[PDB]
Amino acid sequence: TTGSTIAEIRRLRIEIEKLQWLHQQELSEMKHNLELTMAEMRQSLEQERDRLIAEVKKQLELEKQQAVDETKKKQWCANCKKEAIFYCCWNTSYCDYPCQQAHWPEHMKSCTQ
Amino acid sequence: GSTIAEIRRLRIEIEKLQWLHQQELSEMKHNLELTMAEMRQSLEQERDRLIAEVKKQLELEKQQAVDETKKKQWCANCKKEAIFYCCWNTSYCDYPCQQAHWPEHMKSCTQ
Ligand SMILES: [Zn+2]
Ligand SMILES: [Zn+2]
Ligand SMILES: [Zn+2]
Ligand SMILES: [Zn+2]
Numbered sequence: 001t002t003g004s005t006i007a008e009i010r011r012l013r014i015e016i017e018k019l020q021w022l023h024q025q026e027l028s029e030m031k032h033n034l035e036l037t038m039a040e041m042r043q044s045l046e047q048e049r050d051r052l053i054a055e056v057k058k059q060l061e062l063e064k065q066q067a068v069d070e071t072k073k074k075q076w077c078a079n080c081k082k083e084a085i086f087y088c089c090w091n092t093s094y095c096d097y098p099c100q101q102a103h104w105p106e107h108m109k110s111c112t113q
Numbered sequence: 114g115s116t117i118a119e120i121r122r123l124r125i126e127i128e129k130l131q132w133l134h135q136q137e138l139s140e141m142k143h144n145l146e147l148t149m150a151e152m153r154q155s156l157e158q159e160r161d162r163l164i165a166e167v168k169k170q171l172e173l174e175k176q177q178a179v180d181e182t183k184k185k186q187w188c189a190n191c192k193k194e195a196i197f198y199c200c201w202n203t204s205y206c207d208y209p210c211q212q213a214h215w216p217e218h219m220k221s222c223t224q
Pocket of ligand 4: 199200201203218221222223224
C-alpha cells in the first residue's frame with residue numbers, strides 16, 4: 001500500500017533527523033575540558049620538577065659538607081693528593097718517599113726544618 | 114518483495130553505521146588520552162635528563178670542594194683554617210683553640 005510505505009519512510013527519515021542533533025554538546029564541552037586537563041598537567045609537572053631539583057640540591061649540599069668535613073680530619077700528600085702518612089714541614093705531607101722526591105724541586109723553595 | 118521489510122533492513126544498516134561512527138568518536142577520544150599519557154611520560158623523561166645534568170655539575174662542585182680542602186690545614190678544635198701546628202695532623206687557628214683542645218689532645222701528642 002502506497003500510504004503505508006510513505007509513512008514508514010517518513011518515520012525513518014524523522015529518526016535520522018533526530019540523529020543529526022545528537023552529541024553536539026558532548027564534543028563542544030570535550031575541547032574545553034581538554035584545555036583544562038592539559039593546563040593542570042603542565043602546572044603539576046612544573047611543580048614536580050622544582051621539587052625534585054630542590055631535593056637533589058639539598059641532599060648533595062649535605063653530602064658535600066660531609067665530604068669536606070671528613071677531608072679536613074686527614075693529611076693529604078702534597079704531590080699526589082692521596083692520604084699521607086708522614087710530613088716534612090708545615091702543610092707538606094707525603095704518602096711515600098717517591099712523592100717526596102718528586103715534589104722536592106718545587107717544595108725546596110719554601111721548606112722548613 | 115515487501116517494501117516495509119526492505120525499509121526495516123535499511124534502518125538496521127543505518128543504525129549500524131551510526132554505532133560505528135560512535136565507535137570512531139570514542140576511539141579518537143581514547144587516542145587523545147593516550148597522547149596525553151605519552152606527553153606526561155616524555156616530559157618526565159626530559160625532567161630526569163635535566164636532573165642528571167644537575168647531579169653531574171653538583172658532583173663536580175663536591176670534588177672541587179674536597180680538592181680545595183686538601184690544600185690547607187684545619188684547626189683540630191674548631192675546623193676553621195689553621196695557621197700553626199702542634200704535631201702530626203694537629204693544627205690550630207689560634208692559641209685559645211690549642212689551649213682548649215689540650216685536655217683531649219694530650220693523650221696523643223708529640224713535641
Ligand atoms: Zn703521594
Ligand atoms: Zn719541607
Ligand atoms: Zn680553632
Ligand atoms: Zn700535639
